[PDB]
Amino acid sequence: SINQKLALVIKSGKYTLGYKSTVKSLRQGKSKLIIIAANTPVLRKSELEYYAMLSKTKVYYFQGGNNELGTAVGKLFRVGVVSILEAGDSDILTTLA
Amino acid sequence: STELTVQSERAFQKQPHIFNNPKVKTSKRTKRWYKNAGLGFKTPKTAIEGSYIDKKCPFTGLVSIRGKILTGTVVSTKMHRTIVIRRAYLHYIPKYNRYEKRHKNVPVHVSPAFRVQVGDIVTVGQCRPISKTVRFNVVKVSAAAGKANKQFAKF
Amino acid sequence: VLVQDLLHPTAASEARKHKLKTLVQGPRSYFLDVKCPGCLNITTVFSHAQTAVTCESCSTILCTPTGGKAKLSEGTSFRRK
Amino acid sequence: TRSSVLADALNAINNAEKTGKRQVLIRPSSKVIIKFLQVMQKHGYIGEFEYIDDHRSGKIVVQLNGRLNKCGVISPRFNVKIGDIEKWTANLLPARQFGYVILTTSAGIMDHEEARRKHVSGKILGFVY
Amino acid sequence: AKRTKKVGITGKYGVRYGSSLRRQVKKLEIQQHARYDCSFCGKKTVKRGAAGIWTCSCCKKTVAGGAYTVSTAAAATVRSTIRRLREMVEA
Amino acid sequence: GRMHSAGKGISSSAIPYSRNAPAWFKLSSESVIEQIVKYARKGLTPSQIGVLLRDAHGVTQARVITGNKIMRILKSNGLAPEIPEDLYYLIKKAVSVRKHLERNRKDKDAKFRLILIESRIHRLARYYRTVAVLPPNWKYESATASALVN
Amino acid sequence: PQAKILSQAPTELELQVAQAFVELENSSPELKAELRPLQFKSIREIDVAGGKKALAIFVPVPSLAGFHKVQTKLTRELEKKFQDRHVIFLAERRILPKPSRTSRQVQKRPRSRTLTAVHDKILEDLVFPTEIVGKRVRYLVGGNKIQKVLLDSKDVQQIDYKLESFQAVYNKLTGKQIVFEIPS
Amino acid sequence: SKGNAFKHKRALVEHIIQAKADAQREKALNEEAEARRLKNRAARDRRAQRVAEKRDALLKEDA
């Protein structure tokens, strides 16, 4: 039950999208939630686990590949990882999920 | 009319028997002869100032609307200065006492002052044969909304 | 009997027949003024909850919806408003 | 669906009248049937009928006094010219002296003898007798 | 435009070889040249390199699949049944 | 009834005759549009919000209390959804049915079912095309419609 | 101040009621922001069937809901100082003719200004506190027509001694017969 | 251009100049439309908060 609240982030909250933008948004420390697809290369997600651990920020594993994630974020292209800079009326940050 | 670069074709497209003179410069310097079609059909302002020729228009051309006046809807907007209207109507079959939706696609030469688009109810008038199949003229466009002004794509 | 006062049938008839086949399709459901000992705010709850109910002031569960009228929680004090 | 509320009205009355019921109920209670009922009401064919105005077009109840014998609708509503109104009645009326055919008209809704008298025609709504 | 009705890819074989032989090769030659989604990069870029070799054009991966598909049905059931045996032994 | 089924059910809501709010309502019209805004800002369906207006609140209906319907007031409030909820949830249903198809290709029962969703969409899309709720000359391409329904 | 609460300079004849509101000035909680802001338009007087008069004051309904809040309080105090009369509050509402096929087109006529809807709200104005549970109509055998009106038992106390006046004013205003009947 | 319907350059340029000509027109209509959305309505809607409590309501009837 995750896909319903991503539209809340895509419209209310502020996101950044893709790997390079995410790691920049982790380096700046602003990001608190990163959703990593399952199709993404395990090495790229492995060091995103590391960057997430360095920033002490929530990491969520999407239950599908980048195709599901790209549709879930609402964009007809594909997205490896999506970062949640700030979440509005969405509760994904405050919930354990 | 004035726009669309009417003076661009092979020949000199101006109203016959009009007097032009470069010696005397007058208030408007262009003479255009339009006549009201009559029977209550108003002369459009785009024709008062018109520079279109349309020698077969009732207003600026040399024809005359003498006969029937009909109505219909625009269905054929793929054609310059000529229109075909789908005039739906009914016919009474005697034996069964019931009615039957008929229609004919009559073509009419729109005077370029008027604007037509699909869905706009329009009026036409019989005159001398304009083309072989165009034997009417779009004397008045009674499309205050045309069933489409408030339904088009808006921004 | 073909001679019946459908205009003003007895109170037995209305509660017997279906709502939509009554003379006027009046709702038979209602809203309930309900309180909990752990809150200081009133809460109006529809008869058939249709979804979970929680007091704004204190986080709580009031009546879990079912197909019909919801089974209210154990320590729930209900009244018809 | 209910292609004609007038048709289902006159259908319902005949069904209950044949049963002999003293009261019949009609839905969804438009005015054309209400105007139709008035025409019977002035002609004694029908009794006191109570209109119930619920906020969804409501319904009616008609305390028919078991007086008429057959009221029906001509669907669809064929047009008619005054020269041919008598032609229609012969095929629908049990007798000339009694029984009426209802004509909707821009003048109003009336039975044929008055429509003939006031000399205006229209489309046929139904027949009563 | 619409160039052929039913020969499709096999119209290169001319009128020869019969219609049934062209029909069997038709339904596999389509699968042969059809481009497939990579299970690793997610782009519909997997092409058949050789008989049973499926090189994803990007991310330069290659998967040993069927000779005319990225993964045969008779092997998809292999993967499914391997899971349960691994699943039951461990848990 | 039952557009594409043999059912005959008539289970539905029958709202009261009375056109005014009950006596025990203690919210002004300006005090219920605030629950409208802060529930719509969360993106809940106009049907979905009214359920909680009914359940967690004393709001029976927008029309019985306010002067406009829920979907009417959202237009002035500036939270009009991209597409009407009927197409939105039907198409969202359509994508899910299709999403089941490309893997379980031998579901002819669900395959036939899809046409009932598609046909329901197209006739309904015709209505919104007539009244021009959606932009005219619109299509349900059935492939990239997911951009319209996330 | 007589005209400024009358909403119009005319007419000097019916100022006997306007002056009665402006003379309760020792009502500071009730005088301010709820009595001055009310500007009724016109007053009508009709002889009830009982030989007495009921005055039909017309309120322009810009804030009748606000006037409804103090309607219960104001009706009692108005009747006492203006005894042997019945007070009624009406929301005067524009009524436009139904356009004819020979008539020139005009702007659209909304459903509030329709003839049937004003009479719907006339019943609400006529009977403010008691919400009407339902309606009945009886089409008489002689061509007559009646509209029997149902009422709820709650807060009928402010109206049950004014039911006969309700019938008379509607007949005089509309030429239509109605009778009020309450179940239980 | 990758498909047909452009026989040559000047045939293309005619389509482009036509494409520019109308394209300029709908946004010109859009800008005129938006002008109406902020000229005939935006200020005249505020007329109810500046004069409605000014004329024939509070000045003449305040004595």
Swiss-Prot record, chain A:
Gene3D superfamilies: 3.30.1330.30. GO terms for biological process: cytoplasmic translation; negative regulation of mRNA splicing, via spliceosome; rRNA processing. Disulfide bonds: none annotated. GO terms for cellular component: cytoplasm; cytosol; cytosolic large ribosomal subunit. InterPro entries: Ribosomal_eL30-like (IPR039109), Ribosomal_eL30-like_sf (IPR029064), Ribosomal_eL30_CS (IPR022991), Ribosomal_eL8/eL30/eS12/Gad45 (IPR004038). Component of the ribosome, a large ribonucleoprotein complex responsible for the synthesis of proteins in the cell. The small ribosomal subunit (SSU) binds messenger RNAs (mRNAs) and translates the encoded message by selecting cognate aminoacyl-transfer RNA (tRNA) molecules. The large subunit (LSU) contains the ribosomal catalytic site termed the peptidyl transferase center (PTC), which catalyzes the formation of peptide bonds, thereby polymerizing the amino acids delivered by tRNAs into a polypeptide chain. Present with 59300 molecules/cell in log phase SD medium. NCBIfam families: PRK01018.1. This is Large ribosomal subunit protein eL30. It comes from Saccharomyces cerevisiae (strain ATCC 204508 / S288c) (Baker's yeast). The gene is RPL30.
Swiss-Prot record, chain B:
One of its GO terms (molecular function) is rRNA binding. It holds the Pfam family Ribosomal_S17_N. Its main location: cytoplasm. There is a cross-link at K14, K45, K55, K56, K78, K95, K104, K132, K140, K147 (Glycyl lysine isopeptide (Lys-Gly) (interchain with G-Cter in ubiquitin)). This is Small ribosomal subunit protein uS17A. The modification N-acetylserine is found at S1. The keyword rRNA-binding applies.
UniProtKB/Swiss-Prot annotation, chain E:
A zinc finger (C4-type) spans 38-59. Its main location: cytoplasm. It is found in: Cytoplasm. It comes from the Eukaryota. The modification Phosphoserine is found at S39. GO terms for biological process: cytoplasmic translation. Keywords: Cytoplasm, Metal-binding, Phosphoprotein, Ribonucleoprotein, Ribosomal protein, Zinc, Zinc-finger. Pfam families: Ribosomal_L37ae (PF01780). GO terms for cellular component: cytosol; cytosolic large ribosomal subunit. One of its GO terms (molecular function) is zinc ion binding. InterPro entries: Ribosomal_eL37/eL43, Ribosomal_eL43, Ribosomal_protein_eL43, Ribosomal_zn-bd. Gene3D superfamilies: 2.20.25.30. Component of the large ribosomal subunit (LSU). Mature yeast ribosomes consist of a small (40S) and a large (60S) subunit. The 40S small subunit contains 1 molecule of ribosomal RNA (18S rRNA) and 33 different proteins (encoded by 57 genes). The large 60S subunit contains 3 rRNA molecules (25S, 5.8S and 5S rRNA) and 46 different proteins (encoded by 81 genes). Component of the ribosome, a large ribonucleoprotein complex responsible for the synthesis of proteins in the cell. The small ribosomal subunit (SSU) binds messenger RNAs (mRNAs) and translates the encoded message by selecting cognate aminoacyl-transfer RNA (tRNA) molecules. The large subunit (LSU) contains the ribosomal catalytic site termed the peptidyl transferase center (PTC), which catalyzes the formation of peptide bonds, thereby polymerizing the amino acids delivered by tRNAs into a polypeptide chain. This is Large ribosomal subunit protein eL43A. The gene is RPL43A.
Swiss-Prot record, chain G:
Belongs to the eukaryotic ribosomal protein eS7 family. Keywords: Acetylation, Cytoplasm, Isopeptide bond, Nucleus, Ribonucleoprotein, Ribosomal protein, Ribosome biogenesis, rRNA processing, Ubl conjugation. It is found in: Cytoplasm; Nucleus, Nucleolus. GO terms for cellular component: 90S preribosome; cytosol; cytosolic small ribosomal subunit; nucleolus; nucleoplasm; small-subunit processome. It comes from Saccharomyces cerevisiae (strain ATCC 204508 / S288c). N-terminally acetylated by acetyltransferase NatA. Ubiquitinated at Lys-80 and Lys-81 in response to stalled ribosomes, leading to activation of the No-Go Decay (NGD) pathway: first monoubiquitinated by MOT2/NOT4, followed by formation by HEL2 of 'Lys-63'-linked polyubiquitin chains on monoubiquitin. This is Small ribosomal subunit protein eS7A. Present with 41000 molecules/cell in log phase SD medium. There are 2 genes for eS7 in yeast.
